[PDB]
Amino acid sequence: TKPIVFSGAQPSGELTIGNYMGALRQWVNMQDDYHCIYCIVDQHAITVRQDAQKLRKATLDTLALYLACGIDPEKSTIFVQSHVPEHAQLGWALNCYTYFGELSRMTQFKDKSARYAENINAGLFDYPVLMAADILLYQTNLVPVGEDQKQHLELSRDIAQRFNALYGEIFKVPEPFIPKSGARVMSLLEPTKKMSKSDDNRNNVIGLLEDPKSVVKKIKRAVTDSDEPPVVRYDVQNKAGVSNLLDILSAVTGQSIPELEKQFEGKMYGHLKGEVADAVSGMLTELQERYHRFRNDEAFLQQVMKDGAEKASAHASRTLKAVYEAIGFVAKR
Amino acid sequence: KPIVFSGAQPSGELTIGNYMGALRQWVNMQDDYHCIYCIVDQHAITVRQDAQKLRKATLDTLALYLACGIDPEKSTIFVQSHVPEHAQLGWALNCYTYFGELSRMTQYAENINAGLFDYPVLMAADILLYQTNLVPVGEDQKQHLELSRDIAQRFNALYGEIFKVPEPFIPKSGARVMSLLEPTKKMSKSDDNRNNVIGLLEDPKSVVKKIKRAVTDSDEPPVVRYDVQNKAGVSNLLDILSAVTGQSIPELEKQFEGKMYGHLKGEVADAVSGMLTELQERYHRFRNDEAFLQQVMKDGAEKASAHASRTLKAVYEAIGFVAKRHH
Ligand SMILES: Nc1ncnc2c1ncn2[C@@H]1O[C@H](COP(=O)(O)OC(=O)[C@@H](N)Cc2c[nH]c3ccccc23)[C@@H](O)[C@H]1O
Ligand SMILES: CC(=O)c1ccc2c(c1)CCO2
């Protein structure tokens, strides 16, 4: 049997070109090489308060977007997290093998808490433990994520090793799969802050379902630097904006940074922004064309969810049964 | 009938205090209420422990509740982990519980496991799943019941009347059972010193031995009279004897006129062991009938799941999750 790939994305906010290059692009590319399982993590989404109608719509939007990206339900398992009870069941169990201190030191908890001061909830704090359960349920070998999830992923490894040390080879210890390019795509007007899928200022973001004409305008207004003369060179510390544009271009086109720097020799930020705008506009036009075809076919979305939950449940029930036997529960019959 | 929820820890060896207090009280109200007994194995694992002992203790607890007279045809009795909806609802309610509320629980903190921090949310889920009206709580879990009520009202305020707001079951058992070597302190299963307690599985020789050691007083002549302030020990022995036999304190004070504490102790031991005879007979019979315990757990989980699934579906619909597609 093939090694197992697992990853997920939240049906909240609006997925960006950051989410694509950091995760979804890798998801699509791994489907033949590994046994891939992709999850719409609606139980994680509700750690930030959602409108009920928006949550339901976003779950289905996210499914259609996976399909539009090239996630193929004949090759990969695609499912909604809340459809498989074993996620919450294992999450509770792993809560008992996770330390309070490990969770309080998490960067996401701190950042989200600062942002949502009036809803610092226990789910937000416990976020990483449910994420560990998501991964460990499927005997996962590889987890394709962006740089921002590295810390959560490291806890999942710690939990698996801790549990295995007491009980035997119950879990696989998963490894991160973080790409070379596009692992941390930055905001267009604040290039020292990563691109957010729920940014208050939409001008920071390239949304995957956003009007391409609007995206082209946003790229043209992206902040660069005061260098005289302007030079197109990758340098995160001194040229955050220009570097972010190069990273985006590289990730869309497949061209390396040295190749792009050569291409832009004797050229300035007009040429750079023109190429980024054209590459991104084309990608989004094609993606959105596929998206609407999937999004408006409710019978197909319903079948994909049904088949995916069924396949996921088979894997998940097996791991949970072994966990419950190990920790000492009376088995259900 | 109102729905009553009780969580049973698969860990405590129950005492005569537990039995003649709350358990006997509740055994006789199984047709008055819809009583639910949940053996809380998911709560147990917040404290690291031996796995085979936990499995054993789960079955020990099931057999003992059955032996004490919990009727699986009248009441619902099940193992918590057999009903996935507990964990499912628990996660959901985690997202409507303030971090501050959990840190403000009465209970450095860096090395506690997250389960020990977060278990009040699972407790709330346990209760709210079954549209519970009444929860018998000890003083130690009043804060936890209040959190469950706050969560229920908060969720209901956002989404409609999804949950019943549970109430404490106020009226208490009436049987008084204090510690044998410290009669000011209540006989508790959680006591470190086990000579303070009489467990439900103790044989007659162990009961005689523990009751012989029970503290009395230096009154001369010895006098068997009820006086909690001056004669805590003798009073405790009278309350225990009264709880077992149903004889009043005045009747027993008359029965032991001119008698010494040796006679009192002898009668208490005989009365207690007489009560524990039918109980232990039932226990050892039920505990060693694997098929009977299996059927009780299966039937109980089925009844509980039917109720829990309806609540969870309403919760999930309210939050806005896409409904599972069944095959
Ligand atoms: N600016 C950016 N540049 C590059 N990559 C980025 C950027 N912003 C986000 N990402 C990545 O996108 C993926 C989905 O993010 P979410 O916030 O939906 O979702 C998250 O952040 C996960 N916790 C969801 C999850 C739940 N359970 C799991 C189990 C395995 C893997 C992932 C999960 C992520 O890989 C994230 O790293
Ligand atoms: C019962 C409960 O409170 C709970 C359930 C699932 C879960 C957590 C908590 C933390 C990670 O996943």
Numbering used by the authors:
A (entry chain B): 2 to 334
B (entry chain A): 3 to 109, 117 to 336
Provide text from the study.
In this study, seven fragments were observed to bind to an unprecedented pocket buried at the dimeric interface between the CP1 domains of two EcTrpRS subunits. The CP1 domains of both subunits contribute equal residues (Ala89, Gly92, Trp93, Asn96, Asp127, Val130 and Leu131) to build this pocket, and this pocket is generally symmetric in shape and shows both hydrophobic and hydrophilic characteristics. The binding modes of the other six fragments in this pocket are similar to chlorzoxazone, particularly for the hydrophobic interactions contributed by Trp93 from both subunits. Remarkably, although this pocket is generally symmetric in shape, however, all the seven fragments bind to it in an asymmetric way that the electron density maps clearly show a single orientation for each fragment in the pocket. Probably, the binding of TrpAMP caused a slight conformational difference in the CP1 domain between subOpen and subClosed. Site-directed mutations were performed on these pocket-surrounding residues, and EcTrpRS variants with D127A, V130A or L131A mutations were successfully expressed and purified. TSA results showed that the fragments caused significantly smaller ΔTm values to these EcTrpRS variants than to wild-type EcTrpRS, confirming the specific binding of the fragments to this pocket. However, sequence alignments revealed that the CP1 sequences in forming this buried pocket are vary widely between bacterial and eukaryotic TrpRSs. Thus, these fragment hits are likely specific to bacterial TrpRS.
Tryptophanyl-tRNA synthetase (TrpRS) links tryptophan to tRNATrp, thereby playing an indispensable role in protein translation. Unlike most class I aminoacyl-tRNA synthetases (AARSs), TrpRS functions as a homodimer. Each EcTrpRS subunit consists of a Rossmann fold aminoacylation domain (AD, residues 1–85, 140–183 and 299–334), a connecting polypeptide 1 domain [CP1, residues 86–139; CP1 was combined with AD in some previous studies (37)] and a C-terminal α-helical domain (CTD, residues 184–298). Therefore, TrpRS is considered an attractive drug target for developing bacterial-selective inhibitors for fighting microbial infections.
